[PDB]
Symmetry: C2
Subunit: 150 residues, 2 copies
Protein backbone atom coordinates (compact mmCIF):
# COMPACT_ATOMS: atom_id res chain seq x y z
CA UNK A 1 0.00 0.00 0.00
CA UNK A 2 2.25 2.76 -1.31
CA UNK A 3 0.87 6.27 -1.81
CA UNK A 4 1.80 8.38 -4.82
CA UNK A 5 -0.55 11.27 -4.06
CA UNK A 6 -2.65 12.60 -1.18
CA UNK A 7 -5.13 15.19 -2.42
CA UNK A 8 -8.31 16.91 -1.25
CA UNK A 9 -11.02 14.51 -2.38
CA UNK A 10 -8.79 11.57 -3.30
CA UNK A 11 -5.50 9.73 -2.77
CA UNK A 12 -3.69 7.66 -5.39
CA UNK A 13 -2.06 4.51 -4.01
CA UNK A 14 -0.58 1.23 -5.26
CA UNK A 15 -0.87 -2.30 -3.92
CA UNK A 16 1.87 -3.93 -5.94
CA UNK A 17 0.12 -4.12 -9.29
CA UNK A 18 -3.27 -2.55 -8.55
CA UNK A 19 -3.71 1.20 -8.88
CA UNK A 20 -6.17 2.38 -6.23
CA UNK A 21 -7.95 5.70 -5.76
CA UNK A 22 -9.15 6.27 -2.21
CA UNK A 23 -12.19 8.53 -2.17
CA UNK A 24 -14.56 9.79 0.52
CA UNK A 25 -17.95 8.04 0.71
CA UNK A 26 -20.94 9.85 -0.78
CA UNK A 27 -24.72 10.16 -0.53
CA UNK A 28 -27.49 10.67 -3.09
CA UNK A 29 -31.13 11.62 -2.60
CA UNK A 30 -34.07 10.37 -4.65
CA UNK A 31 -37.06 12.72 -4.43
CA UNK A 32 -40.37 12.56 -6.28
CA UNK A 33 -43.08 15.23 -6.23
CA UNK A 34 -46.16 15.39 -8.45
CA UNK A 35 -44.61 12.88 -10.84
CA UNK A 36 -41.37 14.82 -11.22
CA UNK A 37 -38.01 13.62 -9.95
CA UNK A 38 -35.59 16.12 -8.42
CA UNK A 39 -32.54 16.13 -10.70
CA UNK A 40 -29.60 18.54 -10.53
CA UNK A 41 -26.94 19.49 -13.06
CA UNK A 42 -23.62 21.26 -12.67
CA UNK A 43 -20.48 21.66 -14.73
CA UNK A 44 -18.30 18.59 -14.25
CA UNK A 45 -14.74 19.29 -15.44
CA UNK A 46 -13.84 15.60 -15.17
CA UNK A 47 -16.27 14.77 -17.99
CA UNK A 48 -16.55 18.09 -19.81
CA UNK A 49 -20.34 18.23 -19.66
CA UNK A 50 -23.24 18.40 -17.20
CA UNK A 51 -24.91 15.01 -16.73
CA UNK A 52 -28.32 14.57 -15.12
CA UNK A 53 -27.73 13.66 -11.47
CA UNK A 54 -29.73 13.79 -8.25
CA UNK A 55 -28.80 15.76 -5.11
CA UNK A 56 -25.55 14.26 -3.88
CA UNK A 57 -22.26 14.96 -2.18
CA UNK A 58 -19.38 13.72 -0.06
CA UNK A 59 -19.89 12.88 3.60
CA UNK A 60 -18.05 15.39 5.80
CA UNK A 61 -15.99 14.45 8.86
CA UNK A 62 -18.21 13.76 11.86
CA UNK A 63 -21.19 13.10 9.60
CA UNK A 64 -23.07 9.87 9.00
CA UNK A 65 -24.83 9.12 5.67
CA UNK A 66 -28.27 10.28 6.81
CA UNK A 67 -26.95 13.64 8.01
CA UNK A 68 -24.94 14.16 4.82
CA UNK A 69 -28.07 13.41 2.76
CA UNK A 70 -30.05 16.01 4.71
CA UNK A 71 -27.29 18.56 4.20
CA UNK A 72 -26.85 17.99 0.47
CA UNK A 73 -30.59 18.16 -0.17
CA UNK A 74 -30.72 21.50 1.66
CA UNK A 75 -27.53 22.95 0.20
CA UNK A 76 -28.21 21.98 -3.42
CA UNK A 77 -31.99 22.48 -3.52
CA UNK A 78 -32.96 24.37 -0.37
CA UNK A 79 -35.30 21.57 0.66
CA UNK A 80 -35.75 19.26 3.64
CA UNK A 81 -37.84 16.11 3.94
CA UNK A 82 -38.37 12.76 5.62
CA UNK A 83 -35.40 10.59 4.61
CA UNK A 84 -35.30 6.81 4.36
CA UNK A 85 -32.19 4.74 3.63
CA UNK A 86 -32.60 2.60 0.49
CA UNK A 87 -29.29 0.98 -0.44
CA UNK A 88 -25.61 1.55 -1.23
CA UNK A 89 -23.14 0.83 -4.02
CA UNK A 90 -19.46 1.09 -4.92
CA UNK A 91 -19.21 3.42 -7.93
CA UNK A 92 -16.38 1.46 -9.58
CA UNK A 93 -14.79 -1.22 -7.34
CA UNK A 94 -12.18 -2.01 -9.98
CA UNK A 95 -10.17 1.07 -8.98
CA UNK A 96 -11.83 3.15 -6.25
CA UNK A 97 -13.41 2.65 -2.85
CA UNK A 98 -16.01 5.39 -3.25
CA UNK A 99 -19.23 4.07 -1.74
CA UNK A 100 -22.55 5.85 -2.29
CA UNK A 101 -25.45 5.71 0.17
CA UNK A 102 -28.82 6.33 -1.47
CA UNK A 103 -31.82 7.79 0.35
CA UNK A 104 -35.46 8.46 -0.51
CA UNK A 105 -36.87 11.87 0.45
CA UNK A 106 -40.58 12.44 1.05
CA UNK A 107 -42.79 15.32 2.21
CA UNK A 108 -40.43 17.97 0.85
CA UNK A 109 -40.57 21.46 2.32
CA UNK A 110 -38.55 24.53 1.37
CA UNK A 111 -36.23 25.66 4.17
CA UNK A 112 -34.15 28.24 2.30
CA UNK A 113 -26.09 24.22 -9.09
CA UNK A 114 -29.09 23.82 -11.42
CA UNK A 115 -32.30 22.29 -10.07
CA UNK A 116 -34.01 20.20 -12.74
CA UNK A 117 -37.46 18.85 -11.86
CA UNK A 118 -38.30 16.33 -14.58
CA UNK A 119 -40.55 13.28 -15.03
CA UNK A 120 -38.27 10.20 -14.87
CA UNK A 121 -39.94 8.91 -18.03
CA UNK A 122 -38.80 12.04 -19.86
CA UNK A 123 -35.28 11.88 -18.46
CA UNK A 124 -35.01 8.31 -19.75
CA UNK A 125 -36.46 9.27 -23.14
CA UNK A 126 -34.05 12.20 -23.54
CA UNK A 127 -31.10 9.99 -22.63
CA UNK A 128 -32.15 7.31 -25.12
CA UNK A 129 -32.33 10.08 -27.73
CA UNK A 130 -28.81 11.14 -26.79
CA UNK A 131 -29.91 14.56 -25.55
CA UNK A 132 -28.62 14.13 -22.01
CA UNK A 133 -26.12 11.98 -20.11
CA UNK A 134 -26.61 10.28 -16.73
CA UNK A 135 -24.42 10.07 -13.65
CA UNK A 136 -24.73 6.80 -11.72
CA UNK A 137 -26.92 8.59 -9.18
CA UNK A 138 -29.22 9.93 -11.88
CA UNK A 139 -29.69 6.54 -13.51
CA UNK A 140 -30.24 4.83 -10.15
CA UNK A 141 -32.91 7.41 -9.38
CA UNK A 142 -34.64 6.83 -12.71
CA UNK A 143 -34.58 3.04 -12.42
CA UNK A 144 -35.66 3.12 -8.77
CA UNK A 145 -38.68 5.22 -9.72
CA UNK A 146 -39.72 2.88 -12.53
CA UNK A 147 -39.29 -0.12 -10.25
CA UNK A 148 -41.00 1.02 -7.04
CA UNK A 149 -42.57 4.49 -7.24
CA UNK A 150 -45.24 4.23 -9.94
CA UNK B 1 -4.59 20.05 -17.59
CA UNK B 2 -1.42 18.91 -15.83
CA UNK B 3 -0.70 15.21 -15.39
CA UNK B 4 0.77 13.82 -12.18
CA UNK B 5 0.54 10.15 -13.16
CA UNK B 6 -0.03 8.02 -16.26
CA UNK B 7 -0.83 4.44 -15.28
CA UNK B 8 -2.33 1.31 -16.84
CA UNK B 9 -6.05 1.78 -16.24
CA UNK B 10 -5.96 5.42 -15.13
CA UNK B 11 -4.18 8.78 -15.24
CA UNK B 12 -4.23 11.39 -12.48
CA UNK B 13 -4.41 14.97 -13.73
CA UNK B 14 -5.17 18.46 -12.43
CA UNK B 15 -7.15 21.31 -13.96
CA UNK B 16 -6.10 24.09 -11.63
CA UNK B 17 -8.14 23.13 -8.58
CA UNK B 18 -9.96 19.99 -9.75
CA UNK B 19 -8.31 16.60 -9.33
CA UNK B 20 -9.29 14.39 -12.26
CA UNK B 21 -8.86 10.66 -12.84
CA UNK B 22 -9.00 9.69 -16.50
CA UNK B 23 -10.26 6.14 -16.89
CA UNK B 24 -11.11 3.90 -19.85
CA UNK B 25 -14.83 3.51 -20.63
CA UNK B 26 -16.52 0.29 -19.52
CA UNK B 27 -19.42 -2.02 -20.32
CA UNK B 28 -21.80 -4.09 -18.18
CA UNK B 29 -24.21 -6.85 -19.17
CA UNK B 30 -27.61 -7.52 -17.64
CA UNK B 31 -28.75 -11.12 -18.20
CA UNK B 32 -31.83 -12.88 -16.88
CA UNK B 33 -32.59 -16.59 -17.22
CA UNK B 34 -35.37 -18.52 -15.48
CA UNK B 35 -35.83 -15.68 -13.00
CA UNK B 36 -32.15 -15.54 -12.05
CA UNK B 37 -29.86 -12.64 -12.86
CA UNK B 38 -26.27 -13.32 -13.89
CA UNK B 39 -24.10 -11.76 -11.18
CA UNK B 40 -20.34 -12.15 -10.80
CA UNK B 41 -18.00 -11.60 -7.86
CA UNK B 42 -14.24 -11.24 -7.67
CA UNK B 43 -11.75 -9.94 -5.14
CA UNK B 44 -11.58 -6.16 -5.43
CA UNK B 45 -8.43 -4.84 -3.69
CA UNK B 46 -9.69 -1.26 -3.98
CA UNK B 47 -12.56 -2.03 -1.61
CA UNK B 48 -11.24 -5.03 0.31
CA UNK B 49 -14.26 -7.22 -0.40
CA UNK B 50 -16.18 -8.84 -3.26
CA UNK B 51 -19.34 -6.91 -4.13
CA UNK B 52 -22.14 -8.34 -6.26
CA UNK B 53 -21.61 -7.09 -9.81
CA UNK B 54 -22.71 -8.16 -13.29
CA UNK B 55 -20.39 -9.15 -16.15
CA UNK B 56 -18.35 -6.06 -16.95
CA UNK B 57 -15.01 -4.76 -18.10
CA UNK B 58 -13.01 -2.05 -19.82
CA UNK B 59 -13.34 -1.46 -23.55
CA UNK B 60 -10.12 -2.44 -25.34
CA UNK B 61 -8.47 -0.39 -28.09
CA UNK B 62 -10.23 -0.90 -31.42
CA UNK B 63 -13.38 -2.08 -29.66
CA UNK B 64 -16.79 -0.44 -29.49
CA UNK B 65 -19.15 -0.94 -26.51
CA UNK B 66 -21.17 -3.75 -28.09
CA UNK B 67 -18.06 -5.77 -28.93
CA UNK B 68 -16.61 -5.24 -25.45
CA UNK B 69 -19.89 -6.43 -23.93
CA UNK B 70 -19.80 -9.60 -26.04
CA UNK B 71 -16.21 -10.24 -25.00
CA UNK B 72 -16.72 -9.69 -21.27
CA UNK B 73 -19.80 -11.91 -21.20
CA UNK B 74 -17.80 -14.69 -22.87
CA UNK B 75 -14.60 -14.21 -20.88
CA UNK B 76 -16.23 -13.94 -17.46
CA UNK B 77 -19.08 -16.43 -17.90
CA UNK B 78 -18.37 -18.40 -21.08
CA UNK B 79 -21.68 -17.31 -22.57
CA UNK B 80 -22.87 -15.49 -25.68
CA UNK B 81 -26.27 -13.99 -26.43
CA UNK B 82 -28.29 -11.41 -28.32
CA UNK B 83 -27.19 -8.02 -26.98
CA UNK B 84 -29.23 -4.81 -26.89
CA UNK B 85 -27.92 -1.41 -25.79
CA UNK B 86 -29.89 0.00 -22.86
CA UNK B 87 -28.20 3.13 -21.52
CA UNK B 88 -24.98 4.64 -20.15
CA UNK B 89 -23.76 6.47 -17.05
CA UNK B 90 -20.73 8.23 -15.60
CA UNK B 91 -19.70 6.29 -12.49
CA UNK B 92 -18.70 9.40 -10.52
CA UNK B 93 -18.52 12.62 -12.62
CA UNK B 94 -17.21 14.58 -9.66
CA UNK B 95 -13.72 13.16 -10.20
CA UNK B 96 -13.52 10.64 -13.05
CA UNK B 97 -14.59 10.35 -16.67
CA UNK B 98 -15.28 6.61 -16.54
CA UNK B 99 -18.43 6.01 -18.58
CA UNK B 100 -20.27 2.68 -18.45
CA UNK B 101 -22.36 1.32 -21.33
CA UNK B 102 -25.03 -1.12 -20.18
CA UNK B 103 -26.43 -3.91 -22.36
CA UNK B 104 -29.18 -6.50 -22.03
CA UNK B 105 -28.32 -10.08 -23.04
CA UNK B 106 -30.97 -12.57 -24.16
CA UNK B 107 -31.04 -16.12 -25.51
CA UNK B 108 -27.85 -17.10 -23.69
CA UNK B 109 -25.83 -20.03 -25.00
CA UNK B 110 -22.62 -21.53 -23.62
CA UNK B 111 -19.67 -21.07 -25.99
CA UNK B 112 -16.82 -22.16 -23.71
CA UNK B 113 -14.11 -14.90 -11.44
CA UNK B 114 -17.15 -16.31 -9.60
CA UNK B 115 -20.43 -16.74 -11.49
CA UNK B 116 -23.38 -16.06 -9.20
CA UNK B 117 -26.82 -16.79 -10.65
CA UNK B 118 -29.31 -15.27 -8.21
CA UNK B 119 -32.90 -13.97 -8.24
CA UNK B 120 -32.69 -10.15 -8.19
CA UNK B 121 -35.25 -10.13 -5.38
CA UNK B 122 -32.87 -12.20 -3.26
CA UNK B 123 -29.85 -10.07 -4.13
CA UNK B 124 -31.79 -7.00 -2.97
CA UNK B 125 -32.95 -8.74 0.21
CA UNK B 126 -29.43 -9.89 1.09
CA UNK B 127 -28.07 -6.39 0.54
CA UNK B 128 -30.78 -4.83 2.72
CA UNK B 129 -29.80 -7.37 5.40
CA UNK B 130 -26.18 -6.28 5.04
CA UNK B 131 -25.03 -9.68 3.81
CA UNK B 132 -23.68 -8.45 0.48
CA UNK B 133 -22.50 -5.20 -1.11
CA UNK B 134 -23.33 -3.90 -4.60
CA UNK B 135 -21.19 -2.38 -7.32
CA UNK B 136 -22.95 0.27 -9.42
CA UNK B 137 -23.39 -2.31 -12.18
CA UNK B 138 -24.95 -4.81 -9.80
CA UNK B 139 -27.44 -2.32 -8.41
CA UNK B 140 -28.33 -1.05 -11.88
CA UNK B 141 -28.99 -4.62 -12.93
CA UNK B 142 -31.23 -5.25 -9.93
CA UNK B 143 -33.22 -2.03 -10.38
CA UNK B 144 -33.52 -2.53 -14.14
CA UNK B 145 -34.98 -5.98 -13.57
CA UNK B 146 -37.55 -4.73 -11.05
CA UNK B 147 -38.50 -1.88 -13.38
CA UNK B 148 -38.80 -3.63 -16.75
CA UNK B 149 -38.22 -7.39 -16.63
CA UNK B 150 -40.96 -8.76 -14.37
ZN1 LIG C 1 -22.64 19.69 -1.99
ZN1 LIG D 1 -12.69 -8.90 -18.14
Amino acid sequence: RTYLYRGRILNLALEGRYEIVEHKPAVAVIALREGRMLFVRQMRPAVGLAPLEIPAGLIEPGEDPLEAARRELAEETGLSGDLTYLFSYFVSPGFTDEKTHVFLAENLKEVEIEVVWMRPEEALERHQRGEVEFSATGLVGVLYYHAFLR
